[PDB]
Amino acid sequence: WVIP
Amino acid sequence: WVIP
Amino acid sequence: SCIQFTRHASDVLLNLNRLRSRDILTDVVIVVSREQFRAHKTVLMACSGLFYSIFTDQLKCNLSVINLDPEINPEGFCILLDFMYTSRLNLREGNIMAVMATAMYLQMEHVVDTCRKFIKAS
Amino acid sequence: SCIQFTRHASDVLLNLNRLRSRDILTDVVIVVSREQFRAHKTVLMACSGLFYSIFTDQLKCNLSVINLDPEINPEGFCILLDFMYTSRLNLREGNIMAVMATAMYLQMEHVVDTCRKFIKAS
Numbered sequence A, B: 001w002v003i004p
Numbered sequence C, D: 001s002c003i004q005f006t007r008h009a010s011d012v013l014l015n016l017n018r019l020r021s022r023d024i025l026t027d028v029v030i031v032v033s034r035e036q037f038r039a040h041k042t043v044l045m046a047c048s049g050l051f052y053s054i055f056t057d058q059l060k061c062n063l064s065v066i067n068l069d070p071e072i073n074p075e076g077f078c079i080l081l082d083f084m085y086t087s088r089l090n091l092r093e094g095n096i097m098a099v100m101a102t103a104m105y106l107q108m109e110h111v112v113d114t115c116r117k118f119i120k121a122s
Ligand SMILES: O=C1Cc2cc(Nc3cc(Cl)ncc3Cl)ccc2N1
Pocket: C045, C046, C047, C048, C049, C050, C052, C107, C108, C109, C110, D015, D016, D018, D019
């Protein structure tokens, strides 16, 4: 999971 | 396009 | 000896989401309490262990309407349906419990994992 | 303020390809000369400008069989159908002309671009  |  | 187009899967998902927003080729209605959500059976199956089981069933594969368990929160479902079609999860303090419970029911293991991690941190 | 799961789109496409290999929820047959190819209308639309036009047409959206132009090579189509479901293009010296021509007909602009680049190099 990432910060888009 | 890339070499997978 | 194939070549690969890096952005292809993302572009396919973006177009499937555009078809969903315009209600094109949607073949099922998911009923959650009073709320109704139109979707593509294939996308639901690709994202959820529960929908995979439902639509591989010889009788249920032909249903145009699927009713979820009355305990399922429509907002939690809506957040998860958006994630299925975009890869983006709108996870917030006020919705995390409803999102985790809905992801556990829908059998979306990667969403369940991030919810457990975010809950543990707080 | 969403979070994003990097591998989601690729995982969705992988599961759609698994459904295709097992002939699950396929809703159209594409006929290319004597050869028949089963697929999901939504995936074809998401990948091809030609299938997008066909299946948004109020009459054609309901057809279970689509016949392509007799000039289309079944092998070129098969290579492109595999690319739609995997992001991987089996581009070879012996097939590049048939692949480019089929991609131009199917309106798959990124495949057309790589074929033109590979032809120019040789
Ligand atoms: O967390 C999850 C997500 C998920 C998706 C699917 N859907 C498929 C799985 C296979 Cl192997 N082939 C085809 C399909 Cl559409 C099943 C279980 C789960 N669990």
